[PDB]
Amino acid sequence: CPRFLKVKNWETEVVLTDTLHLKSTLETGCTEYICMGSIMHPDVATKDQLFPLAKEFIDQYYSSIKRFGSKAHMERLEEVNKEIDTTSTYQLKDTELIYGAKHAWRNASRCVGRIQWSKLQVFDARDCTTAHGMFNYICNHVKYATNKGNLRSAITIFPQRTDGKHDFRVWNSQLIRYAGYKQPDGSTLGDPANVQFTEICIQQGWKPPRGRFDVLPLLLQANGNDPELFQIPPELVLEVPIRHPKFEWFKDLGLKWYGLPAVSNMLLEIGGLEFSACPFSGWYMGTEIGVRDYCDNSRYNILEEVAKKMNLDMRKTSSLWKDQALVEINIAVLYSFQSDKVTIVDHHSATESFIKHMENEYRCRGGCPADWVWIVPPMSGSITPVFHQEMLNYRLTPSFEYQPDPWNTHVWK
Amino acid sequence: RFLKVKNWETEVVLTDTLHLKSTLETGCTEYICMGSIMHPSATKDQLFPLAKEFIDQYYSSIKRFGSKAHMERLEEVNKEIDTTSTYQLKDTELIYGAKHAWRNASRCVGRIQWSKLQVFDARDCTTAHGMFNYICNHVKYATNKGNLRSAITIFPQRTDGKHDFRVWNSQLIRYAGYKQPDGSTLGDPANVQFTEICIQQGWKPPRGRFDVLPLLLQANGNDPELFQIPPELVLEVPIRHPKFEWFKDLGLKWYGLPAVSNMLLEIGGLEFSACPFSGWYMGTEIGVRDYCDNSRYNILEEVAKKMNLDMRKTSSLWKDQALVEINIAVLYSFQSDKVTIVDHHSATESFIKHMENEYRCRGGCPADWVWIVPPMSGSITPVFHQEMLNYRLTPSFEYQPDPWNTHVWK
Numbered sequence: 001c002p003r004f005l006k007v008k009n010w011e012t013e014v015v016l017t018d019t020l021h022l023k024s025t026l027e028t029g030c031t032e033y034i035c036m037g038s039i040m041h042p043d044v045a046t047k048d049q050l051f052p053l054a055k056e057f058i059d060q061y062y063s064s065i066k067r068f069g070s071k072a073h074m075e076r077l078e079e080v081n082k083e084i085d086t087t088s089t090y091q092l093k094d095t096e097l098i099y100g101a102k103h104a105w106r107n108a109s110r111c112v113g114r115i116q117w118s119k120l121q122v123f124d125a126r127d128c129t130t131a132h133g134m135f136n137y138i139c140n141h142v143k144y145a146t147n148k149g150n151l152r153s154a155i156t157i158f159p160q161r162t163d164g165k166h167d168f169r170v171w172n173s174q175l176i177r178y179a180g181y182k183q184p185d186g187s188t189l190g191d192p193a194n195v196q197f198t199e200i201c202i203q204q205g206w207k208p209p210r211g212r213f214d215v216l217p218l219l220l221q222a223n224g225n226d227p228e229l230f231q232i233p234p235e236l237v238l239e240v241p242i243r244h245p246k247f248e249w250f251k252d253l254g255l256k257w258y259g260l261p262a263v264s265n266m267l268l269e270i271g272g273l274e275f276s277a278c279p280f281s282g283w284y285m286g287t288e289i290g291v292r293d294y295c296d297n298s299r300y301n302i303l304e305e306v307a308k309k310m311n312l313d314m315r316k317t318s319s320l321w322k323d324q325a326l327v328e329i330n331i332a333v334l335y336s337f338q339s340d341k342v343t344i345v346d347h348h349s350a351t352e353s354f355i356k357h358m359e360n361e362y363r364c365r366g367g368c369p370a371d372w373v374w375i376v377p378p379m380s381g382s383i384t385p386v387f388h389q390e391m392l393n394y395r396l397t398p399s400f401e402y403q404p405d406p407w408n409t410h411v412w413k
Numbered sequence: 414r415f416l417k418v419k420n421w422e423t424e425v426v427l428t429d430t431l432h433l434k435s436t437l438e439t440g441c442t443e444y445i446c447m448g449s450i451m452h453p454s455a456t457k458d459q460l461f462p463l464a465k466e467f468i469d470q471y472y473s474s475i476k477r478f479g480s481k482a483h484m485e486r487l488e489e490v491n492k493e494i495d496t497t498s499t500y501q502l503k504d505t506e507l508i509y510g511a512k513h514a515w516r517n518a519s520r521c522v523g524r525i526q527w528s529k530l531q532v533f534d535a536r537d538c539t540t541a542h543g544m545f546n547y548i549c550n551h552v553k554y555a556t557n558k559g560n561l562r563s564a565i566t567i568f569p570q571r572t573d574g575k576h577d578f579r580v581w582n583s584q585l586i587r588y589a590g591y592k593q594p595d596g597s598t599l600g601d602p603a604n605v606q607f608t609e610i611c612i613q614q615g616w617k618p619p620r621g622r623f624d625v626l627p628l629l630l631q632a633n634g635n636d637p638e639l640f641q642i643p644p645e646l647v648l649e650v651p652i653r654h655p656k657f658e659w660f661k662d663l664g665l666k667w668y669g670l671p672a673v674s675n676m677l678l679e680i681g682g683l684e685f686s687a688c689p690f691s692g693w694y695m696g697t698e699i700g701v702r703d704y705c706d707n708s709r710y711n712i713l714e715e716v717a718k719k720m721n722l723d724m725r726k727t728s729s730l731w732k733d734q735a736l737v738e739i740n741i742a743v744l745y746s747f748q749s750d751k752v753t754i755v756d757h758h759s760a761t762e763s764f765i766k767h768m769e770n771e772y773r774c775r776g777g778c779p780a781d782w783v784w785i786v787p788p789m790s791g792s793i794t795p796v797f798h799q800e801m802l803n804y805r806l807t808p809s810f811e812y813q814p815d816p817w818n819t820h821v822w823k
């Protein structure tokens with residue numbers, strides 16, 4: 001590969017130069033002859049495999065704290081090596097763990113919120129041994145991160161993977177999500193996105209209230225054991241009823257959402273170590289709720305009902321009734337969150353921050369991996385500054401990765 | 414290897430095999446994806462294999478592969494490259510190559526229409542006057558009094574690179590843009606340079622907001638010459654709004670015919686440096702990009718002011734409101750004047766249908782999600798949820814440099 005790669009902004013003319021891509025680690029799935037950039041997703045490491053992955057990471061850490069080549073550096077190297085040699089694995093120092101998590105966020109190509117990356121509260125939970133303990137750590141995470149509506153980004157890191165027969169897993173895709181109930185007639189009550197997991201919970205013994213906005217239980221797996229159900233204390237689940245500053249009838253739709261977005265099904269990879277349970281949280285960009293959660297056909301799909309109350313012509317598409325309802329819904333979502341002093345960012349403020357962020361990164365770091373297909377908002381794309389920004393996409397480590405759903409791989413005891 | 418694309422809304426999966434047939438490069442590598450880069454970056458000896466590939470594809474298309482006709486065509490083309498360092502397409506070939514350059518345009522959402530293309534052979538052209546004649550005929554035909562018709566006009570192929578044919582306008586019909594002494598811009602800011610270049614060539618600028626630019630035409634590598642498109646051939650629409658009486662008072666208008674004129678058509682190794690093609694508009698092209706881009710007409714603030722919207726915080730989403738309204742007026746206006754147009758909902762529907770057609774009968778369809786997904790209300794259109802595979806098939810449309818950056822004058 002050539003040393004320098006240039007990206008252009010087509011509305012400001014600014015040109016950046018990327019050299020960081022030279023540290024890329026994994027294959028993107030793209031080739032010389034095909035681009036998989038809109039594909040959503042394009043047994044443990046051996047001693048030999050782990051050795052250089054650990055060294056790669058350790059060198060990077062010591063270079064970050066400006067101690068590269070130092071005695072402490074060479075010693076840490078030697079200690080990691082012995083520990084891999086005799087135990088087939090190694091343990092991170094607290095400093096390294098914090099660094100690793102922060103940088104995995106810093107490296108998340110698909111995240112528009114990464115200007116905040118270095119303000120992340122890390123909760124070390126590698127001493128956890130049971131599902132009840134996981135429940136304890138998750139409740140503390142939720143309470144701290146929620147902070148009465150003044151949200152704070154956090155990650156809780158459970159023990160790494162060992163032989164793969166003892167994984168810690170949060171079976172929920174997010175710590176907080178609403179149930180979906182398939183009806184005998186084909187309709188879905190609540191959130192259709194969560195139907196599969198809800199059925200799992202019910203089989204596992206969950207008594208469902210069978211409502212439209214029932215918070216799902218946590219389904220938690222420690223040390224490779226069968227998962228166990230716990231109810232999140234309702235007082236820890238901050239929620240916002242959705243109203244509209246102009247449309248008084250909007251409240252009569254009975255919509256609400258939860259304040260804390262906390263993805264819990266991803267895998268954190270640091271120096272070749274695999275943390276299969278690492279729930280992390282920030283705060284919402286309005287569109288994640290207002291456009292996706294609410295207006296996706298396979299989600300709450302309320303465009304129709306909202307358009308009706310707006311008395312729009314719904315017989316032509318060229319009326320753009322859908323487009324018109326979408327904006328109002330998103331206005332209500334931002335309005336309700338701000339009114340209740342719960343942290344939320346609109347897609348304009350977010351994409352502008354991110355452009356500023358990306359610029360700083362290119363200048364101080366020599367680059368910033370970004371996935372345009374994900375970075376650009378799902379509404380009003382071209383009137384946000386990221387639309388016109390060229391991005392390069394590539395995989396740096398430490399990183400967050402997808403993993404299979406645990407019910408597909410789990411060996412039931 | 415076969416490749417699967419999934420639609421996450423319908424859960425439908427299609428299997429791509431056609432991608433095995435490309436040879437050109439996309440710009441990505443295994444380690445870096447450049448899917449969001451706008452522009453990633455002959456001889457006798459190079460020419461024949463390219464020719465052989467295209468001839469083979471053609472006779473395969475008409476189910477006469479390995480036929481007598483096929484065999485001789487191939488030798489005819491080899492002898493001609495041998496003895497002239499180039500060759501000339503048959504008319505049938507020219508037509509087949511042009512339709513398939515459109516079929517292979519990964520960034521074009523309108524490709525369901527692809528085999529409905531009127532192909533104008535202008536390869537006998539020699540002067541800028543001829544070009545102008547050919548272009549007026551195109552414009553008049555494709556406009557069709559509002560019932561627009563897809564068309565392309567193909568001027569002589571590149572020979573030695575010293576004698577290119579070029580349409581220096583980026584589109585046949587665009588409005589002028591003027592640098593105002595106080596720093597602002599009158600008209601269309603995307604065209605300020607080209608406008609100054611016309612003024613420098615002797616064009617007398619009305620210095621208004623919607624001045625149709627002259628044709629600047631280059632033939633056989635000569636200096637370019639100015640021509641005024643007869644006004645009655647230029648179909649335009651005054652933009653008004655079905656609810657907002659005051660929208661007409663903004664004085665806004667646009668042209669009915671989108672006719673891109675600065676790209677390059679490549680067929681079997683031949684380069685057609687001048688090949689204006691036109692179709693009809695998707696609403697958002699005018700209503701989102703042309704009017705609301707900051708480096709364009711930048712009219713969002715004006716419209717939102719008449720709507721009496723709170724413009725003090727971004728989170729009131731006033732920009733998003735004005736945007737939808739502008740795009741309503743645009744669709745309304747065209748349809749009222751019976752000028753062909755398509756809204757991004759219907760267009761994206763059509764395209765998902767096209768993909769299904771193309772996977773079924775052709776084993777795939779190249780597509781650029783970055784460009785295919787509309788610049789407003791993305792995820793409430795079906796293409797947002799459609800995985801797409803991009804790859805470059807030939808015959809094709811490519812980009813070329815602006816001719817003023819290369820041309821040595823007189």
Ligand code: HEM
Nearest residue numbers: 105108110111112113116153154280281282283284285400
């Ligand atoms: C603090 C405010 C944050 C904002 C505004 C934000 C914004 C976003 C948005 C809009 C997405 C796309 C989500 C979707 O379309 O479903 C996203 C994805 C993502 N974010 Fe951030 N995020 C924030 C915090 C964080 C934190 C704290 C982390 C990790 C430490 C993180 C890591 C990620 C990752 C890994 C993805 C990709 C998820 C996937 O592919 O499924 N984000 N973010």
Ligand code: HEM
Nearest residue numbers: 515518520521522523526563565690691692693694695810
């Ligand atoms: C018939 C109705 C058509 C519609 C509704 C349509 C729609 C579009 C749109 C919205 C774009 C994106 C352009 C942009 O955002 O700047 C595009 C791109 C493109 N179209 Fe189509 N188009 C049509 C016909 C055609 C025809 C007739 C041709 C050629 C014979 C064509 C070839 C292309 C090419 C080569 C691009 C890529 C332009 C670039 O890369 O800059 N299209 N089309």
Ligand SMILES: Cc1cc(N)nc2cc(-c3cncc(CN)c3)ccc12
Nearest residue numbers: 261262263280281282283284285288
């Ligand atoms: C940290 C964080 C913050 C934030 N505002 N949104 C997120 C959204 C996701 C996310 C990714 N894929 C799917 C979903 C569920 N539709 C959510 C993950 C993490 C997020």
Ligand SMILES: Cc1cc(N)nc2cc(-c3cncc(CN)c3)ccc12
Nearest residue numbers: 671672673690691692693694695698
């Ligand atoms: C055939 C055709 C039809 C249509 N409706 N729009 C087009 C738009 C373009 C196009 C592509 N890139 C840049 C521009 C100028 N902003 C225009 C090219 C051809 C088009």
Ligand SMILES: C[C@H](O)[C@H](O)[C@H]1CNc2nc(N)[nH]c(=O)c2N1
Nearest residue numbers: 387388389390449450451783784
């Ligand atoms: C940087 C980015 O590639 C650029 O803004 C692209 C994004 N997608 C686009 N899509 C379309 N249809 N037209 C465009 O001009 C662009 N611009």
Ligand SMILES: C[C@H](O)[C@H](O)[C@H]1CNc2nc(N)[nH]c(=O)c2N1
Nearest residue numbers: 038039040373374797798799800
């Ligand atoms: C097909 C496509 O990759 C898929 O629909 C993606 C597109 N971009 C996205 N962007 C974000 N932020 N979130 C998403 O879920 C998606 N979905």
Ligand SMILES: [Zn+2]
Nearest residue numbers: 030035441446
């Ligand atoms: Zn790619």
